[model samples]
Each structure stands twice: as C-alpha cells, then as structure tokens.
Target: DERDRVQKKTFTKWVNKHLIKAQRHISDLYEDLRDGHNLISLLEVLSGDSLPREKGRMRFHKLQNVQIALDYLRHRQVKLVNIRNDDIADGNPKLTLGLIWTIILHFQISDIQVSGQSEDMTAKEKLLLWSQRMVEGYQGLRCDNFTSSWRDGRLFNAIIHRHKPLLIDMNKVYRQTNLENLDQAFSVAERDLGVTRLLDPEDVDVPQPDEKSIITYVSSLYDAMP
Candidate 1:
C-alpha cells in the first residue's frame, strides 16, 4: 500500500508518455530526414478535433539525457573480470561514471573556467577549453549516458556532450587550482544533469534528410571522444 500510495510511477508513466510524444518530437527534430510527421504535432492537430483526449495528452515535452563516461577506476573494476577488454573501458558504466566525475571535479572545472569571449585572446582560449571540457565531462556521467544507450548505441554513449552552439576553443585546459579540490565541485554541478531536458532522447537527434542518415549523423557525436 505504501509503495502504491506515494511517489507514483513517474518514471514509467513519464517514459511511456515521452515515447508516445517522442514519435512526433524526434520526427520534428529531424524534419529534413523526412522520415515521418511529427508525432506530438500530429497529436496536437488531432486534439484540435477532440478536446478531452487532447487535454489528457502531454502538456509539454521535457527531456533528460543520460551520459556514460569512461573512467580509470571503473576501468579497474571492469578489468577485475576481463581487465583487458579494450572494446570497453571500465565495462561497468556506472562505476566509470563515478570515476570520471571524480576526475573532473578534482580539477576545479566548474568555477573559474571561462569561455573564449573575453578581450584577452590567450586567456579566453585557455579558459574556454577547460570550461567546455569540464562542462561536457561533468554532464556525461551525471546523465548516465554510458549505461542508458548501451542497449541501442554504446559508442555514442560516453561523454555526453550535445556538441552544439558551433563555437568553442578546444585548447588544453589551463588549470589554476589543484586537482583534488575541483573533484568535489562536480557533485554539485553534475548531480543535476539527471533531471534536465538535455537528456531527452528526442532532443539529442539533429536534423538530417533521411532516416538512415539521421541515425548516422547522431552517431558522429563521439567521433573524437574515447
């Protein structure tokens, strides 16, 4: 009774509703793919004819992306069994996710890291690189991209950077603080990614002209990362 009375199955109910909406959400997101009509939009149009049913449908769409990160410690955990499995690092995504977070936060990435937008070109470039990488790595593990997509596409799962904005300076991170202190900050920053729209599977897909191409385009997200 206690289990049924509280907490409601938001995960299941929300996931199902999300899937029903995803057909449209993903379609609209990849409109150029021309795979099909937007599921959500079509549902809206149908709702135009029916009020009660339409009203009961999703009020709005929100997404949360899960990112899986490869980490050294998790690497050891995985190796405890196969240990030599290069096909995957830290075969246990959850373990690796924790380790990756540990590394980023250890480096003091969240606070002082900056974007390459300031008057000082060199400092801007350096800060931006650190900021971006730290931000990306921070999000990767928090979202659990590693384990979530292993079922569908394992390769794209690690280091869940949305790869957006089209503007970034990828220079090496210039660290000011020691690695240990920075490691603690990620718990505050990364802890929240699990609840954000950035994880929603539909939001992750970019526009492409065809169904097959759409999948391929999304796959390249990790062309650079390990």
Candidate 2:
C-alpha cells in the first residue's frame, strides 16, 4: 500500500510538475498547424499507412464527412515561447491540462463495485463514473484554458503549479476510498457480516453499501480533498 501510495504520488507530481513546458501534449490534432480541410487531407494521407508510423495522424471524426469552415493552418503559429499560469495561450494549456489528468485517472487501481454492489452502481461502475468526471473536469478546465470566470493572470507556471495538487488529490483520494470500501467489504465477508461470496471464485458478489458508508469512507481518507 505504501509503495502504491508513493508511486502514485511520485507519478502525479512528475506529471503536473512539468507543466512548465506546456504544448500540444494531448490531442495531436491540437499539435499540428493544419486545421480544417488540410487536416482532412492529412488524415487521408495518413490513413493509407499502418499503425505506429501513422501515429502522426490526428483523429477528428467531427469533420470526417463535412467541409471545414476554414482553409490551411490559420492557427498553426509556433512562436518560440513557453508559459504556464496565465501566460500560455488557450490552445497549448487546454491540451496539457486535459491530457495530463486523463492519463492519471484512467489508470486508477480501484475495482468495480467498490461501494458494495448496488442496483444503480457497482463498485467498478462508481469508479468509472468518478474517473469520467475527473477527466471531464480536467479536460473542461483546459478545454477553454479555464476560459470562464476561473481565468486569472497569474504567471502561467504558477497557475499550473498551484492547480496541479488539486488534481492529484482527486485521483489519490478516490483511489484510497475505493480501496477502503473494498477492504471493509472483505472484512465483512470474512466474518459473514455484510459480504457474501459468489458461486464462482472469479465472481465476487457485491451488495450495495449505503451512501453514508461511502461518505464516511471518503471523509476518513481525504479531509482536504477538493
């Protein structure tokens, strides 16, 4: 558990720590200067190739069958600049924020049906929901570069640096809460209390845990979690 905790912490720090070099790190579509129909041509060009090498291809199904609104790479200006907080433009920062947390939350260690098995939510389903939310939140913030009322003029570096811990906290706390629920369920089953074993060893049965149970577990795990 300690190893897992440390590794997660380390990886989280590593990911957010390097926001100083923000660029088109998320969707490669955001990477190239080619937008619109040029993007389509590039897609067609790459489609003829195989995997790995064709990784340069961007996936924009939104415009798959439609004509682009613009021509050429109008937004493909690559100035020799780097920024973090409020300095980086919407394009680069948005991609960085979305991509970073997506990779983190998507790789969580929690099992399905952690809150006990419920008709509405299994443990894994809960985690999946949670993961999706985290991804959305992170992506949304970056989608517009925190474009709304959240926007501030703090140094780009400072903004990302400050905001990152919150993201990491979300990932870590959810992971621990899921672990706690699983552990508690295990204990209950071992004592023939709240848990029931499935007919197959591979199929662990889950009974729905009450909302209070989940809230209590989460609170115990992360008092300062955002």
Candidate 3:
C-alpha cells in the first residue's frame, strides 16, 4: 500500500484546486459513461445546469451534438475550437472545452488501439489519401474539377504534423511515463506544447494543462460542410 502511493502521487498528489477538479471530473465523467450516462446528460450534471428549476433548457439539436462531437473525437480525434478574445489576454472557455474534447479523444484512441483496425495504410499514406479526398470535396463545392496538389500538399502536411504529435503524446502518456513520473513528464511537455503562451507575466504560475490539453488546443480545425 505504501509502495504504490508515491507512484500514484504524480497525478493524484496535486493540491491545486482547478487541476484537482479537472482531473477528478475527467475520471468521474468516465465512470458516468461506464454507468451508462450519455456524454451530454453527464455534461448537464457536471456543468451544474441540471438542477431543478434550472431554466437553461438545452435545445434538442444542441443535445444531439454530444454524440456528434464524441463520434468525431472518438473515431478521428478532430473537432473545431472557437476562440474570440474579449480582453487583451486569452481565456479558458474555449480552452476548457477543448481540453474536454482532448481528454475524450485521448481515451477513445487508447480504446481503439486495444481492439480493432481496418486500414493497412501507413500514417503518411492515409494523410495523402485523406487530402486527396478533401481536395475533391472542396472542389465539388466550388464546381471545379481540377485544382492542384500544390495547395493540397501544404495543407496535408500541416494537418498530419499537428495530428501526429497528439497521437505521440497519448502514446507517451501510456508508454513513456507512469503514475510515478507523470508530473515530471508533464513539466517537460508543457514547454513541448507551447503552454507558455497561456501565461501572463503578472500572474502566479497556474497549473499546466496535461498532454491532452496541449494537443487539443494546438491541433488543426475542420469546418462543417454542407
């Protein structure tokens, strides 16, 4: 019992309030999912808008988006993050939401690796093919048959490079570090992920977002197609 406690302390040992809640909510949400609560339903409870007489009635389409967001994050680890600055500095609404998606995506990717696969293509090949499909889809929308690979190749490389690091970090979470070393590993990853950008010189050092936080925030975005 005493032996593993130190090891568990990497994550479990955190005394910070936001980090504490963030990590705890992540685990609690997983338990809720395992207990058969759909993600959106759990979001209501977790977000504290589910109380009786709580007048915030989420629209049906908004509720349906839980599955939509989850499906994309689960299968492809992709989502759109909206960032608009009201002040001189960045804020957490988008960052927090992105973190949530990242955590979900990380676990789902983990789940995928443990079970099934259909593709034999390498990561690069998949990127190349995916870009080709994307090029055609966009061209179809524009009513154009022939564009060029010049634009597509740059776009493909940008996306694949971004996506690869996230997968690498998820892999790092499981492979490169353990419960004992997680905190230490994360310190290095903070700089690795450019979390330095989130800090203000006038502020105390806030607890860093973990690997998924870094990934979700920095990863590429795709728009909704008609």
After superposition on all C-alphas, the RMSD of every candidate to the true structure, in Å, is 20.5, 19.7, 18.1
> Once model 1 is optimally superposed onto the true structure by TM-score, how far is the C-alpha of residue 194 displaced, in angstroms?
5.0
Which segments of model 1 are wrong by more than 4 Å?
Answer: 1-128, 131-157, 160-195, 208-226
**lDDT of model 1 at position 138:** 39
Predicted structure 3, TM vs. truth:
0.20
Superposition error at 107 for model 1 (Å): 23
Instruction: Estimate the TM-score of every prediction.
Output: 0.16, 0.20, 0.20
lDDT-wise, the better of 1 and 3 is 3
lDDT of 1 by residue, 1-226 (tens): 3221111221222223334544532312212112112222332342333212122222121110011112222432422233222222223433322322233232222223244455544422444343344345533323222223222222222223233212221221122222222222222223433321112233222121122121222222222223
Candidate 3's residue-wise lDDT over 42-63, tens digit each?
3333344442221233444333
Per-residue lDDT for 64-104 in model 2, tens only? 21123111111223121232212212235334333322332
For model 1, the local distance difference test gives 0.26
Using TM-score, rank the candidates from best to worst: 2, 3, 1
- lDDT of model 3, residue 57: 30
Clashing pairs in 3: none
